């Protein structure tokens, strides 16, 4: 129903959606910072500048840009790490990532976790693991 949510949210019933309505859209899920993190992802849709965006460039703003694999995979895999994150650190490693997907047997996991983390560091946070994604 992603659809299904962006007339749902055009109370108006028009079939179309703005800077406002988008900011509540997000803001529905978190507070962090949407009112700035949309104005950069909104202006990036929005060629023009009109301040108002359509289902179509809703439904391509849902993603980022242009491509999408799963957000809800994305939305999902955030999730699951903090369900199972009950130690309270908000970030994670590849040992640790490697250590509970080990788990499962999939250790190719490692070694997209390794090339994802071009930095060497050898951990990732939460706002690091979300914007990877994007
Ligand atoms: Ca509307
Ligand atoms: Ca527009
Ligand atoms: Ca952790
Ligand atoms: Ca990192």
């Given at each position: 129903?992603?659809?299904?949510?962006?007339k749902?949210?055009?109370?108006?019933?028009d079939?179309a959606?703005?800077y406002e309505?988008?900011?509540?859209?997000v803001?529905?899920?978190?507070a962090?910072?949407?009112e700035?993190?949309?104005?950069?992802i909104?202006?990036?849709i929005?060629?023009?500048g009109?301040?108002?965006?359509?289902?179509?460039e809703?439904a391509?703003?849902?993603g980022?840009?242009?491509?999408?694999?799963?957000?809800?995979?994305?939305?999902?895999?955030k999730?699951?790490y903090?369900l199972?994150?009950?130690?309270?650190?908000?970030?994670?490693?590849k040992?640790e990532?490697?250590?509970?997907?080990?788990?499962?047997?999939?250790?190719?996991?490692?070694?997209?976790?390794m090339?994802?983390?071009?930095?060497?560091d050898?951990?990732?946070?939460?706002?690091?693991?979300?914007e990877?994604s994007?």
């Open positions: 129903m992603a659809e299904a949510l962006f749902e949210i055009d109370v108006n019933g079939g959606v703005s309505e988008v900011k509540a859209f803001s529905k899920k978190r962090i910072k949407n700035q993190l949309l104005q950069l909104f202006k990036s929005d060629a023009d009109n301040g108002e965006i359509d289902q179509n809703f391509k703003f849902y980022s840009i242009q491509g999408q694999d799963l957000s809800d995979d994305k939305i999902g895999l999730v699951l903090k199972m994150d009950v130690d309270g650190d908000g970030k994670l490693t040992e990532v490697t250590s509970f997907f080990k788990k499962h047997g999939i250790e190719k996991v490692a070694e997209q976790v090339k994802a983390d071009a930095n060497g050898g951990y990732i946070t939460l706002e690091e693991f979300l990877f994007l």
